[PDB]
Amino acid sequence: ADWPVNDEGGLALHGVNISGAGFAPHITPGKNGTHYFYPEKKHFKYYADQGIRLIRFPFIWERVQHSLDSGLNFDQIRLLKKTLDLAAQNGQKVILDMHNYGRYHGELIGSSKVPYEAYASVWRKLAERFKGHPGLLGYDIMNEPHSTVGLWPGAAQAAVDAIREVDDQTLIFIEGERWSSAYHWPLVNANFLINDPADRLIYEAHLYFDDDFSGKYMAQTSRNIDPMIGVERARPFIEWLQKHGQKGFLGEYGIPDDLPEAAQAMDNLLAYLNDNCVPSAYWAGGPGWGTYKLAIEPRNGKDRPQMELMRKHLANDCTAIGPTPA
Numbered sequence: 281a282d283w284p285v286n287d288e289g290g291l292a293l294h295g296v297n298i299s300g301a302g303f304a305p306h307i308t309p310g311k312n313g314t315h316y317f318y319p320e321k322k323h324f325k326y327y328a329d330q331g332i333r334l335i336r337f338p339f340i341w342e343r344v345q346h347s348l349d350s351g352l353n354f355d356q357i358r359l360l361k362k363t364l365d366l367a368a369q370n371g372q373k374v375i376l377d378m379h380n381y382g383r384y385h386g387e388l389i390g391s392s393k394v395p396y397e398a399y400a401s402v403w404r405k406l407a408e409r410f411k412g413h414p415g416l417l418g419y420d421i422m423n424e425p426h427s428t429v430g431l432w433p434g435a436a437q438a439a440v441d442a443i444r445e446v447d448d449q450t451l452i453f454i455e456g457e458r459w460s461s462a463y464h465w466p467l468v469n470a471n472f473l474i475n476d477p478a479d480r481l482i483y484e485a486h487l488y489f490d491d492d493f494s495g496k497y498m499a500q501t502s503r504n505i506d507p508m509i510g511v512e513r514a515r516p517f518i519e520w521l522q523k524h525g526q527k528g529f530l531g532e533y534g535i536p537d538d539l540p541e542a543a544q545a546m547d548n549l550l551a552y553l554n555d556n557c558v559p560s561a562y563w564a565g566g567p568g569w570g571t572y573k574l575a576i577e578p579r580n581g582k583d584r585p586q587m588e589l590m591r592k593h594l595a596n597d598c599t600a601i602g603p604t605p606a
């Protein structure tokens with residue numbers, strides 16, 4: 281709905297994931313500044329300066345709620361509020377992403393140890409904290425569910441119901457099973473459907489270019505990247521979206537800076553996304569990435585090759601989030 285817009289027209293479709301509040305997730309709670317990191321004004325200013333108004337921001341449940349019998353961590357909420365504040369001051373809107381893989385402290389959401397009600401409450405409580413914030417675009421209620429033994433769809437509806445008890449205005453982003461793979465979407469999530477009477481739900485998949493779909497880009501699995509593998513891995517998902525009359529988001533995709541074939545695949549993917557008015561978020565920019573080959577964070581004030589590749593694709597004349605249903 282209130283999707284960010286570009287200055288010369290169109291929508292802010294193509295954004296960035298920003299580190300690093302979900303870093304080192306096995307270390308909980310860990311310490312801010314050591315194990316995980318939050319961005320500063322420089323990051324939001326840089327990406328705004330590049331014409332980027334969309335940000336996906338991972339965090340983990342374990343740092344907002346250390347235990348199910350505990351309330352929310354005040355400082356972590358304050359850190360997320362700061363993130364939303366700095367985004368909004370720079371004309372950006374943020375997707376808060378609970379980067380939790382269908383699990384809480386390693387146990388499955390929907391298991392006896394982590395009931396659906398515990399997930400619903402945390403999202404209800406989080407939505408109470410951030411309801412109405414100008415820099416908030418919506419809630420990516422779970423990153424990359426996998427091996428959830430049938431538990432993910434019920435958990436997603438429990439969180440949505442709870443969120444809509446307190447906030448009927450924020451967008452909600454729904455990922456699917458099999459790590460929310462875009463290529464596998466029509467087979468894994470063939471009959472996947474969450475109920476949102478607000479009509480403010482978007483489905484979200486991830487897509488990488490290596491042979492095992494993982495985005496790790498190991499040497500043996502990254503030797504033959506077709507220039508169209510990005511379009512081929514997006515199309516199943518887009519086609520499922522069009523058939524079900526639903527809106528999409530490619531929440532992660534990224535390439536190493538040393539694979540020319542990956543560059544071509546990214547250019548053709550973003551072009552295809554634009555043709556369908558489908559937004560995306562590059563993985564990843566922000567603090568703490570060092571020389572990570574996929575990182576789009578500049579170094580020495582030198583733009584990264586992936587930022588330079590993104591720029592040709594920012595302009596559009598879309599007025600609604602797609603794809604366009606049949």
Ligand SMILES: OC[C@H]1O[C@@H](O[C@H]2[C@H](O)[C@@H](O)[C@H](O)O[C@@H]2CO)[C@H](O)[C@@H](O)[C@@H]1O
Pocket residue numbers: 457458459460461462485486487488492493494495
């Ligand atoms: O990274 C996103 C991407 O993961 C892809 O599959 C991987 C998974 O990421 C990896 O950790 C696991 O061990 O094996 C699989 C093999 O694909 C995944 O298919 C996509 O859903 C996901 O978007």
